């Protein structure tokens, strides 16, 4: 919490960029910390078709390391830097822990059952295929078909690097902000 | 402390007196480094204070390393995007140490600047803190009234029949039930009034000896209706025990008890000792009109709110009654034909005179008694006139705030409609872009990514 | 004077008329030296006035050599660190001569700027001086209520038993004494009421001839308790003489006297002349409830405050009573069976009608009398209705300010807790530095010097 | 919406979680152009705000 401590010192934001984020961050939460209830207010504004509260709850837990209860600007930026301008390795572990709801690191088709459901839930019911009750399960079933060999952290890391299509989509936002 | 920091040379000068009576260990003075005023441009209006002024409170935004986020380097000034006429009171804190509340500024914006700059409402000066809390209370009550959760079938009929019981103005069955309950209460009380009055001989027989065969049927029908509606209310109350503990259920139980109590009493033997008591208790179905009329609820709320004032009313009334009854008894005792036989006998005269009622059957007949009777009348006026305005004022305030929260709910529904309209407009704006601003281009890319991560597309 | 200084050429022009009728002594004109506007930057907001405007009042901060302390040389401007929107009214003084009070600014900050710049509250203009004092009174009352010294054993038991007597809500013995005194007062007054009423023959004998053997014992026990508690109060009053002169001690002695007075009279001979008077005085133990209940104290305070209005009430009441009694007597004198034998006999009817009481035993029976009786009733309503609201308004204001002072004391204890917390935090901060800011480094050196001049060390 | 516009990098950071469970079609990021505060002199009293602050309510 200095401005120079979170400078280009394993944080991928410049001095001017850190100033811009803090001005916008403190605008919504003047206290310097944003909580889960406010965390869902901004996220739901970007996606008005449905509700993003279900996905923001899982997103907040990934941001809120150590389950403190509120995420501070010091560790709010380092999550953005890893996700936006971070390396390949740092992005995958962050996303792996986003799906890994529990403490130990393991995905059992049920922890991320709500993760994929949240992505489909945050669209409302207005889509052309009119969605379905079992369409999130089909997405999960095909998702496991490409990394789940027998029944982990190592499997997730090597599977994404194997196919370049997801690789060129992870780095989508590093060029523009 | 750090607040008195310009007096450090004074404190260091005072320390010179210790040296003659000390044992100098070379206390190693810190040997500090060595003060131009800095600019705090809060959205156009530049504010200039010395840096040492801000540093004397190193736990807020202005005195900290936190303001390095708001430093604008090429202009050599700190640019904040906050209110220019509320940051004025922020700087006045760093000079004196006490915050001042502006009487002309909204308290929801004043608290926003205090939270932004790190100040707290606990350090505002005592000169204006009584007003700050009073204006904070009104804002707090505005939040509570707006967030009372008045919204009103995924589960059984209990909830959807309780919403009808709680709100009889909605639906079509709730209104019918409300009207039929009101009609039954009215016909029951009117039937009691009629059966009390004589209707028509050996004697002037009332309407309860030759008649009152069908009156008993009407009374038992009304009691049965009250019991069944109470049971239906019970079958839809999530707080069944707490609902019973509520005042309305207590009133309902008191209203329905007398018929069953009388039937039980008359099953085995019969005496007139509890007959008149139960007949008196039968009229307690009047108080069941509290649900029907908001006026009764407001009156009950205003009596419960100022319960202490009613206690003082009773205490002072008893005090004056006892004093004046004693005075009149000992002043009008030796009269020829005097009805002031005792102090309890003078209680009737005292309470008649104090309320300025007057009957003329029991009056003083002595020069000493008349003066004290007039003084008693004036003192009764004085005593009764004290708590009357506060009861009426509280009743008026409660009624106004209850009819003010009515439009507060109306503005909430309109506000949610605007939010939904914006959500529909934002969704529709994306479709127009898909068919054919600065931030809108980037925001629509996020929705485009959401479409193509699930191979789905939003449509109209 | 110096206020009208721009009119000096006008005054010098007027002096030309003296020269024809004068005797020229060469009055030696001073031959002065010979005006650019100067900047007064009060924390960012620059204020520009001519130097001659400030110099016309050479006894304040702005017009003096005192502002040379606030001159900032490299910027060629005077920099003050004061309020920018309260200094606006400082400059308006140097132009016109009258200060203006802003209705939207705290008076504790307005007086701070006046004291800083040398102005005084005696020069503020008559246009806004009534409200300035009114807002000053509220601030002054806030200081007095906050500094009432409500804090509550290095000496004998007198002080520590008086603190229990004054405040019976604390400790455990004080509450017991309060409850037992209240119970004794209640049982005494109830016993008097019961012994007045008959209980049961030769005659309808009251409860004071066959009974009242144990009633005398109860009365003397209550009187003994009152006397001993008064003596205990006396044995703990630092203002013993002034405490006796207080209203509460007067009420206590008036309450306790009747028993001893009656015993003294009955020791030698016995007559009924003072028997009824002493029995009437015996009920004065009712007023001892003033200590127990705050309501009686508030009522006494509000009657004492508006004592002039009660005097006007009595004067107008007597005036109207005399006028209407005379009118009714001379208008209802020749009736066949008339109770209006005289104006003193008409006082009873007049005071009954004016208070809208009504008895019907003494009524007019003439066309002339009835009109004046109705006019008397209306005039009584008008006369009594005038001082009633002011008594109730003062009572409500006093009660609210007494509840207001309750939370005023609560915030004082909170501020002292924060002051002590800051003192503990400042002391703890030094220890953390010893185990392992700008001003904090120098301040901790002073404490280090204090350690080593007494060869002692602060520890946790 | 456009009111919360300074949180766009936060929303873009949140979108990274979709990529592992997505089927990347090259969603074609807009590739925007790239912020000095502007002056709003309302009759003598200059008011300074960033241009992005005003553009959030178009």
In which domain, by residue range, is A34 found?
1-177
Partner residue opposite D15 with nearest CB, options B44, B441, B449: B449
Taking the CA of residue B111 and the nearest CA in chain D, the distance in Å comes to 21
Taking the CA of residue B98 and the nearest CA in chain A, the distance in Å comes to 21
Tally the domains of chain A. 1
Tally the domains of chain B. 3
DSSP string computed for B152-217? ---S-HHHHHHHHHH-TTSTTHHHHHHHHHHHHHHHHHHHHHHHHSB----S--BTTTSS-HHHHH
- Cross-chain Cβ contact C446/B312 below 8 Å: no
Local structure of A106: helix, strand or coil:
coil
**How many Å separate Cα C18 from the centre of its chain?**
61
Write the Ramachandran bin of B31: left for phi over 0, alpha for psi from -120 to 50, otherwise beta.
Answer: left
In degrees and rounded to multiples of 5, residue C99 shows phi and psi of -75, 150
CB contacts of B7 in chain C (<8 Å) are none
Taking the CA of residue B400 and the nearest CA in chain C, the distance in Å comes to 21
Taking the CA of residue D24 and the nearest CA in chain A, the distance in Å comes to 6
Binding residue numbers of A = 100, 102, 104, 106, 111, 148, 150, 155
Q: Which helix (H) or strand (E) holds C48?
A: strand C45-50
- Cross-chain Cβ contact B422/A48 below 8 Å: yes
Is A157 in contact with A92 (CB distance < 8 Å)? yes
Whether B11 and B128 share a structural domain? yes
Nearest CA in chain B to A29: B116
Restricting to D residues 17-56, those with a Cβ less than 8 Å away from any Cβ of B are 18-19, 21-23, 25, 27-30, 32, 37, 39-40, 45-50, 53, 55-56
- Cross-chain Cβ contact A156/D20 below 8 Å: yes
Of A25, A104, A93, the C-alpha closest to A62 is A93
Of A148, A11, A152, the C-alpha closest to A92 is A152
In degrees and rounded to multiples of 5, residue C302 shows phi and psi of -75, -30
**B370 in any annotated domain:** yes
Is the minimum CB–CB distance between B74 and chain A shorter than 8 Å? no
Partner residue opposite B69 with nearest CB, options A3, A47, A127: A3
In which domain, by residue range, is B279 found?
157-295
Whether C169 and C87 share a structural domain? no
Taking the CA of residue D10 and the nearest CA in chain B, the distance in Å comes to 12
CB contacts of B458 in chain A (<8 Å) are 49, 123, 126-128
The answer for residues whose C-beta is within 8 angstroms of residue B122's C-beta and 6 or more apart is C414, C418
Distance CA B270, CA B257 (A): 18
How far, CA to CA in Å, does B410 sit from each of A23, B394, B422, C440, C458?
35, 25, 19, 55, 63
Return the ∠ at Cα B260 (arms to B254 and B262), rounded to 5°. 100
Taking the CA of residue B131 and the nearest CA in chain A, the distance in Å comes to 24
Partner residue opposite C441 with nearest CB, options B19, B30, B316: B30
DSSP string computed for C140-190? HHHHHHHTS------S-HHHHHHHHHH-TTSTTHHHHHHHHHHHHHHHHHH
Restricting to A residues 6-65, those with a Cβ less than 8 Å away from any Cβ of D are 20-21, 23-25, 27-28, 42-43, 45-46, 48, 55, 59, 62
How far, CA to CA in Å, does A91 sit from each of A160, A161, B302, D12?
11, 12, 62, 13
**C445 in any annotated domain:** no
Nearest CA in chain A to B457: A127
Whether C300 and C346 share a structural domain? yes
Is the minimum CB–CB distance between C115 and chain B shorter than 8 Å? no
Whether C271 and C391 share a structural domain? no
Taking the CA of residue D42 and the nearest CA in chain A, the distance in Å comes to 24
Residue whose tokens read 């079509």: B172
**C435 in any annotated domain:** no
- Cross-chain Cβ contact C146/B130 below 8 Å: no
- Cross-chain Cβ contact D14/A84 below 8 Å: no
Distance CA B454, CA C238 (A): 88
Strand partners for B40: B47, B78
Distance CA C41, CA C45 (A): 6
Please report, for the domain that includes residue B27, its CATH number: 3.30.710.10
Which structure tokens are listed for B120?
A: 């707290």
Partner residue opposite B65 with nearest CB, options A3, A47, A120: A3
Whether C289 and C176 share a structural domain? yes
- Cross-chain Cβ contact A26/B443 below 8 Å: no
- Helix and strand numbers, DSSP H then E, in chain A: 9, 2
Restricting to A residues 106-135, those with a Cβ less than 8 Å away from any Cβ of D are 112, 115-116, 119
Distance CA C162, CA C229 (A): 12
CB contacts of B454 in chain D (<8 Å) are 22
**C352 in any annotated domain:** yes
Whether B213 and B121 share a structural domain? no
CB contacts of B49 in chain C (<8 Å) are 43-44, 81
Q: Which helix (H) or strand (E) holds A156?
A: helix A153-162
In degrees and rounded to multiples of 5, residue D39 shows phi and psi of -105, 135
- Cross-chain Cβ contact C418/B329 below 8 Å: no
Local structure of B45: helix, strand or coil:
strand
DSSP string computed for C90-151? HHHHHHTS-B---TTS-HHHHHHHHHHHT--TTSB-GGGSHHHHHHHHHHHHHHHHHTS---
Number of A to B CB contacts under 8 A, please give it: 62
- Cross-chain Cβ contact B426/D39 below 8 Å: no
Taking the CA of residue C31 and the nearest CA in chain B, the distance in Å comes to 42
Is the minimum CB–CB distance between B441 and chain D shorter than 8 Å? yes
Whether B361 and B375 share a structural domain? yes
Whether B347 and B403 share a structural domain? yes
Local structure of B436: helix, strand or coil:
coil
Whether C92 and C138 share a structural domain? yes
Whether C140 and C186 share a structural domain? no
Last residue of a domain, one of B261, B295, B329: B295
Is A31 in contact with A71 (CB distance < 8 Å)? no
- Cross-chain Cβ contact A95/D13 below 8 Å: no
> How was this model experimentally determined?
cryo-EM
Which chains have at least 3 CB atom pairs separated by less than 8 Å from chain D?
A, B
- Cross-chain Cβ contact A129/B456 below 8 Å: yes
Put the strands of the sheet holding B71-72 in their side by side order.
B45-50, B37-42, B77-80, B71-72
Whether C302 and C312 share a structural domain? yes
Distance CA C282, CA C192 (A): 9
Binding residue numbers of A for Ca(2+) = 100, 102, 104, 106, 111, 148, 150, 155
**C2 in any annotated domain:** no
Instruction: Count CA atoms closer than 13 A to C342's CA, side-chain side.
Output: 2
Strand partners for C72: C77
Last residue of a domain, one of B236, B265, B295: B295
Which structure tokens are listed for A153?
A: 């952290």
Distance CA D50, CA C274 (A): 93
Q: Which helix (H) or strand (E) holds B79?
A: strand B77-80
The answer for residues whose C-beta is within 8 angstroms of residue C202's C-beta and 6 or more apart is none
Is B452 in contact with D23 (CB distance < 8 Å)? yes
Whether B73 and B182 share a structural domain? no
How far, CA to CA in Å, does A125 sit from each of A44, A47, B255, B460?
15, 13, 52, 11
CB contacts of A127 in chain B (<8 Å) are 456-459
Is the minimum CB–CB distance between B446 and chain D shorter than 8 Å? yes
**C427 in any annotated domain:** no
Q: Which helix (H) or strand (E) holds A167?
A: helix A164-170
Distance CA C20, CA A150 (A): 127
- Cross-chain Cβ contact A173/D22 below 8 Å: no
* Signed CA dihedral, A130, A133, A139, A141: sign only: negative
Partner residue opposite D13 with nearest CB, options A80, A92, A119: A80
**C450 in any annotated domain:** no
Local structure of C420: helix, strand or coil:
helix
* Signed CA dihedral, B163, B169, B172, B175: sign only: positive
Is the minimum CB–CB distance between D10 and chain B shorter than 8 Å? no
Of C139, C91, C156, the C-alpha closest to C119 is C91
Please report, for the domain that includes residue B382, its CATH number: 1.10.287.70
Which structure tokens are listed for C447?
A: 């404490």
In degrees and rounded to multiples of 5, residue C369 shows phi and psi of -65, -35
The Cβ of residue B362 has, within 10 Å, a number of other Cβ atoms equal to 17
Is the minimum CB–CB distance between D53 and chain A shorter than 8 Å? no
**B423 in any annotated domain:** no
- Cross-chain Cβ contact A119/B81 below 8 Å: no
Of C119, D13, C272, the C-alpha closest to A80 is D13
Is the minimum CB–CB distance between A143 and chain B shorter than 8 Å? no
Taking the CA of residue A98 and the nearest CA in chain B, the distance in Å comes to 17
Q: Which of B454, B457, B459 to mutate to test binding with chain A, by most A CBs within 10 Å of its CB?
A: B454
Last residue of a domain, one of C117, C147, C177: C147
Taking the CA of residue C406 and the nearest CA in chain B, the distance in Å comes to 12
Is the minimum CB–CB distance between D12 and chain A shorter than 8 Å? yes
Q: Which helix (H) or strand (E) holds C78?
A: strand C77-80
Please report, for the domain that includes residue B177, its CATH number: 1.20.120.350
The yes-or-no reply on B/A contact (3 CB pairs or more, < 8 Å) is yes
The 3-state secondary structure of B352-408, one letter per residue: HHHCCCCCCCCCCCCHHHHHHHHHHHHHHHHHHCCHHHHHHHHHHHHHHHHHHHHHH
Distance CA C322, CA C320 (A): 5
């Amino acid at each position: 919490p200095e401005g120079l401590e979170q400078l280009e010192a394993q944080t991928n934001f410049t001095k001017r960029e850190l100033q811009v984020l803090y001005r916008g961050f403190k605008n919504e939460c003047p206290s310097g910390v944003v909580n889960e209830d406010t965390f869902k207010q901004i996220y739901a504004q970007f996606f008005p078709h449905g509700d993003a509260s279900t996905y923001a709850h899982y997103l907040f837990n990934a941001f809120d390391t150590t389950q403190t209860g509120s995420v501070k600007f010091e560790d709010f930026v380092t999550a953005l830097s890893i996700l936006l301008r971070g390396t390949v390795h740092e992005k995958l572990r962050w996303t792996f822990n986003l799906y890994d709801i529990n403490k130990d690191g393991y995905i059992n088709k049920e922890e991320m059952m709500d993760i994929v459901k949240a992505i489909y839930d945050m669209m409302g019911k207005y889509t052309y295929p009119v969605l379905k009750e079992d369409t999130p399960r089909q997405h999960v079933d095909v998702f496991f078909q490409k990394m789940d060999k027998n029944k982990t952290l190592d499997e997730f890391l090597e599977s994404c690097q194997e196919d370049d299509n997801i690789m060129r989509s992870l780095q989508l936002f590093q060029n523009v902000m | 402390a750090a607040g008195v920091a310009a007096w450090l040379p004074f404190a260091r000068a005072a320390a010179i007196g210790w040296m003659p009576v000390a044992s100098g260990p070379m206390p190693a003075p810190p040997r500090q480094e060595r003060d131009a005023l800095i600019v705090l441009n809060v959205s156009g209006t530049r504010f200039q204070t010395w840096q040492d002024t801000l540093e004397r409170y190193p736990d807020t935004l202005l005195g900290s390393s936190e303001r390095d986020f708001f430093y604008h380097p090429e202009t050599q000034q700190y640019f904040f995007d906050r209110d220019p006429d509320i940051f004025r009171h922020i700087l006045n804190f760093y000079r004196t140490g006490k915050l001042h509340y502006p009487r002309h500024e909204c308290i929801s914006a004043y608290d926003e600047e205090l939270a932004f700059f790190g100040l707290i409402p606990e350090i505002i000066g005592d000169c204006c803190y009584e007003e700050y809390k009073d204006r904070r209370r009104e804002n707090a009550e505005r939040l509570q009234d707006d967030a009372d959760t008045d919204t009103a079938p995924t589960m059984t009929a209990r909830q959807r029949v309780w919403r009808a019981f709680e709100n009889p103005h909605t639906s079509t069955m709730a209104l019918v039930f409300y009207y039929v309950t009101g009609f039954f209460i009215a016909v029951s009380v009117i039937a009691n009034v009629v059966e009390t009055v004589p209707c028509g001989h050996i004697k002037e027989l009332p309407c309860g000896e030759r008649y009152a065969v069908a009156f008993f049927c009407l009374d038992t029908a009304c009691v049965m209706i009250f019991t069944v509606e109470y049971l239906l209310r019970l079958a839809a109350a999530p707080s069944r025990y707490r609902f019973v503990r509520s005042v309305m259920s207590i009133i309902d139980v008191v209203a329905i008890l007398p018929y069953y109590i009388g039937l039980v009493m008359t099953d085995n033997e019969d005496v007139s000792g509890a007959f008149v008591t139960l007949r008196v208790f039968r009229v307690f179905r009047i108080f069941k009109f509290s649900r029907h009329s908001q006026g009764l609820r407001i009156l009950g709320y205003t009596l419960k709110s100022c319960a202490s004032e009613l206690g003082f009313l009773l205490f002072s009334l008893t005090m004056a009654i006892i004093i004046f009854a004693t005075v009149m008894f000992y002043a009008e005792k030796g009269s020829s034909a005097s009805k002031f036989t005792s102090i309890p006998a003078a209680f009737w005269y005292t309470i008649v005179t104090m309320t300025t009622l007057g009957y003329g059957d029991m009056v003083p007949k002595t020069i000493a008694g008349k003066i004290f009777g007039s003084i008693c009348s004036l003192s009764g006026v004085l005593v009764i006139a004290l708590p009357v305005p506060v009861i009426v004022s509280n009743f008026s305030r409660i009624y106004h705030q209850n009819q003010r929260a009515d439009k507060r709910r109306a503005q909430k529904k309109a506000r949610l409609a605007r939010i939904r309209a914006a959500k529909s407009g934002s969704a529709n704006a994306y479709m127009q872009s898909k068919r054919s601003s600065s931030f809108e281009t980037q925001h629509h890319h996020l929705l485009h990514c959401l479409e193509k991560t699930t191979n789905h597309e939003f449509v109209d």
